[PDB]
Amino acid sequence: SLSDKDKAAVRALWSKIGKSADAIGNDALSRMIVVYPQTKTYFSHWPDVTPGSPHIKAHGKKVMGGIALAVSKIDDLKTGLMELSEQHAYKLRVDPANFKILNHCILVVISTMFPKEFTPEAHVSLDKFLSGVALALAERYR
Amino acid sequence: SLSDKDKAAVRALWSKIGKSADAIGNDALSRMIVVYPQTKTYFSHWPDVTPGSPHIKAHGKKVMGGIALAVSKIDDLKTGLMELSEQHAYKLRVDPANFKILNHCILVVISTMFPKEFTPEAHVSLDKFLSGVALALAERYR
Amino acid sequence: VEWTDKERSIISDIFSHMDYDDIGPKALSRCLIVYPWTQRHFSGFGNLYNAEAIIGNANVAAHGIKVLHGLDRGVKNMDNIAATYADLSTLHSEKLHVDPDNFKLLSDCITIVLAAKMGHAFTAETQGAFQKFLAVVVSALGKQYH
Amino acid sequence: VEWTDKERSIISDIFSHMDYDDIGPKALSRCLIVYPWTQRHFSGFGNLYNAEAIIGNANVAAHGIKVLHGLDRGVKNMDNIAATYADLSTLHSEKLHVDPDNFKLLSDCITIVLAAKMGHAFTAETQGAFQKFLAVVVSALGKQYH
Ligand code: HEM
Ligand code: HEM
Numbered sequence: 001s002l003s004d005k006d007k008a009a010v011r012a013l014w015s016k017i018g019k020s021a022d023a024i025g026n027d028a029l030s031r032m033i034v035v036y037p038q039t040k041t042y043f044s045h046w047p048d049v050t051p052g053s054p055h056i057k058a059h060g061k062k063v064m065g066g067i068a069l070a071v072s073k074i075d076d077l078k079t080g081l082m083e084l085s086e087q088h089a090y091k092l093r094v095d096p097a098n099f100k101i102l103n104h105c106i107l108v109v110i111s112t113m114f115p116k117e118f119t120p121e122a123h124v125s126l127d128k129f130l131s132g133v134a135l136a137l138a139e140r141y142r
Numbered sequence: 143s144l145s146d147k148d149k150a151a152v153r154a155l156w157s158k159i160g161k162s163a164d165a166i167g168n169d170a171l172s173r174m175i176v177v178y179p180q181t182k183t184y185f186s187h188w189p190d191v192t193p194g195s196p197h198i199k200a201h202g203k204k205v206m207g208g209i210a211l212a213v214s215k216i217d218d219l220k221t222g223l224m225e226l227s228e229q230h231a232y233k234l235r236v237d238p239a240n241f242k243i244l245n246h247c248i249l250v251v252i253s254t255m256f257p258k259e260f261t262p263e264a265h266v267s268l269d270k271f272l273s274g275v276a277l278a279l280a281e282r283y284r
Numbered sequence: 285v286e287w288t289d290k291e292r293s294i295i296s297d298i299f300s301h302m303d304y305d306d307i308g309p310k311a312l313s314r315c316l317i318v319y320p321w322t323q324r325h326f327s328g329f330g331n332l333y334n335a336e337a338i339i340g341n342a343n344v345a346a347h348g349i350k351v352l353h354g355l356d357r358g359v360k361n362m363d364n365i366a367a368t369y370a371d372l373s374t375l376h377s378e379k380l381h382v383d384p385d386n387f388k389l390l391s392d393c394i395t396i397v398l399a400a401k402m403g404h405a406f407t408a409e410t411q412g413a414f415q416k417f418l419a420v421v422v423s424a425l426g427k428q429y430h
Numbered sequence: 431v432e433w434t435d436k437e438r439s440i441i442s443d444i445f446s447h448m449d450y451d452d453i454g455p456k457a458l459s460r461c462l463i464v465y466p467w468t469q470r471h472f473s474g475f476g477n478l479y480n481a482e483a484i485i486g487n488a489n490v491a492a493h494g495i496k497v498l499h500g501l502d503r504g505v506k507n508m509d510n511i512a513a514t515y516a517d518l519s520t521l522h523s524e525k526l527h528v529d530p531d532n533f534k535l536l537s538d539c540i541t542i543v544l545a546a547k548m549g550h551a552f553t554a555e556t557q558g559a560f561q562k563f564l565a566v567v568v569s570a571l572g573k574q575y576h
């Protein structure tokens with residue numbers, strides 16, 4: 001659960017890097033199937049499931065904005081994300097265990113981009129939120 | 143979030159099975175430490191780390207009473223077990239990934255002793271439960 | 285991987301009494317309920333929308349036995365499970381596409397089932413050696429995910 | 431495990447440039463802080479409830495240098511890791527009562543702090559080899575655990 005501190009902490013950093021929210025996702029989405037090339041199972045219908053390609057990069061945007069929507073509705077990611085929950089749970093039935101991996105590559109990519117803003121303090125807060133974003137996604141899975 | 147139905151299912155199950163909680167608790171830790179020896183780190187205070195030791199059974203009891211209280215607080219798991227969060231996090235400094243471990247365990251023990259009660263239906267809605275249980279307990283960590 | 289002898293009797297034993305047509309359907313059917321994302325592939329098996337429509341799916345019955353037997357070889361190839369499962373893995377990876385996290389989720393459904401069938405016979409002991417065999421197959425099961 | 435040359439080189443590169451004196455302290459600092467339960471064995475290194483307490487503590491900085499430098503040995507013993515760390519594994523297990531999962535937590539934080547160090551040179555492929563390493567080594571620190 002994200003305290004207040006957190007909301008601020010998070011929110012107050014989204015501020016900084018929201019402009020790079022596009023590029024951040026194509027890079028996090030790339031580091032996902034490089035180091036963890038078994039998450040490529042869901043993407044297997046994309047001829048170019050390879051680092052920073054048309055699909056992978058284009059998708060990058062509609063996942064980071066997905067992280068945008070979340071960051072806004074942080075006070076209620078379950079209500080705010082519920083539509084995604086249908087999406088990943090009743091459509092592209094994505095094993096929840098994979099969201100951790102993605103987060104993981106989203107922290108790393110933001111470090112390598114904003115090594116000064118992404119502090120430990122914005123680490124624990126961002127981390128909590130990320131887990132936050134995962135559970136909501138796993139709202140209607142089962 | 144526990145569905146209304148999940149709530150009703152956790153309550154049934156612990157109706158038929160709360161009878162024998164200490165037996166469960168005991169066989170549960172017994173299994174955690176023997177099948178996950180990376181957990182004896184927290185029980186190091188003791189000499190007594192024998193599967194079914196005396197010190198290991200009082201604690202079994204100690205461990206399900208919190209369960210019993212979880213069912214009793216199944217509307218708010220966060221709030222309800224706040225105290226138990228305080229001990230584990232900062233007194234005990236229990237790595238939270240050890241929650242998922244005693245949970246598969248309690249569910250294995252639960253499966254040994256009550257095969258008729260543990261339907262898949264009972265099984266699912268109780269996984270959903272202790273997982274939130276596990277998450278309620280990570281509240282005071284950071 | 286290493287392997288005690290008592291890991292070998294218990295494991296060997298566990299396939300002597302194991303009801304294959306009992307627990308087989310009882311564990312995949314149990315997989316797709318506690319972890320319904322696992323129905324991601326079996327989509328052609330028929331009706332699976334609600335719980336007993338899964339316990340009421342004969343195909344999962346069938347296949348669940350398949351699965352069960354699929355750990356046969358491993359019992360034979362204990363010191364060569366990966367080399368032995370290499371092509372199973374590769375199949376589930378390139379043809380099937382199954383997310384390898386699910387492998388590990390069926391195991392806990394196989395475990396658990398056996399657990400109510402053996403009752404006071406599925407000791408810590410046996411759970412230890414039982415898990416410490418499925419957690420090797422799965423591995424191998426994943427080893428060819430490139 | 432089995433390494434390719436690129437993975438050989440990559441761990442050659444990274445570890446040759448490592449400013450252990452920065453990264454070292456930090457990666458323990460950020461882990462203490464983002465993973466407070468790992469402050470189980472650092473308690474008497476001073477007070478640690480605050481950001482400034484940790485980052486500004488020398489019993490951790492100079493401690494994070496140990497750990498990092500402990501990585502040294504694996505880069506040179508590139509195929510003997512498990513063998514090599516079995517005294518690091520036995521120690522941390524039967525001498526300090528550490529939770530092996532805490533290895534990957536710290537490993538993890540070693541990648542965030544390093545990745546903030548290296549930035550774009552640190553591609554996915556770069557990440558891949560470094561987390562392979564720590565994974566390899568981490569499995570080597572969790573062996574003596576019984
Ligand atoms: C941070 C966590 C995640 C967020 C915010 C997220 C969000 C989204 C969004 C917004 C879409 C919409 C696609 C569209 O508009 O066409 C989508 C699709 C998708 N998601 Fe994710 N997702 C997350 C994690 C994952 C993970 C971990 C996987 C599997 C490894 C995954 C698999 C997919 C797939 C396969 C699609 C289909 C996109 C396409 O076909 O173009 N998602 N996700
Ligand atoms: C599964 C959910 C759990 C519940 C409901 C639970 C509940 C409790 C309760 C009620 C106590 C009593 C505190 C006291 O007055 O001594 C306790 C203590 C303790 N718990 Fe937990 N616990 C859980 C999981 C765990 C796990 C997985 C571990 C180990 C990884 C753990 C480690 C401990 C330790 C070390 C103590 C103190 C025992 C002593 O020092 O004598 N707990 N727990």
Ligand code: HEM
Nearest residue numbers: 322325326350351352354355376380382386387388390425
């Ligand atoms: C203990 C691990 C597993 C074993 C022993 C196993 C066994 C098998 C075997 C022997 C086959 C037949 C393939 C062939 O020879 O053509 C099969 C097929 C298949 N498996 Fe697995 N499996 C395992 C894990 C999984 C899991 C966890 C899933 C789902 C998440 C899965 C999904 C499938 C699917 C969709 C098929 C296709 C059926 C067919 O073409 O016959 N497998 N499995």
Ligand code: HEM
Nearest residue numbers: 468469471496497498499500501526528532533536537571
């Ligand atoms: C990447 C994984 C790790 C490596 C390579 C590593 C390596 C080392 C090394 C080389 C030492 C020096 C021995 C000494 O000072 O006596 C050490 C000591 C120690 N480490 Fe680790 N370590 C790791 C993870 C951890 C973790 C996760 C913790 C706890 C959260 C931890 C806690 C300690 C403690 C308490 C000492 C003993 C210091 C003393 O006796 O004064 N280490 N470690």
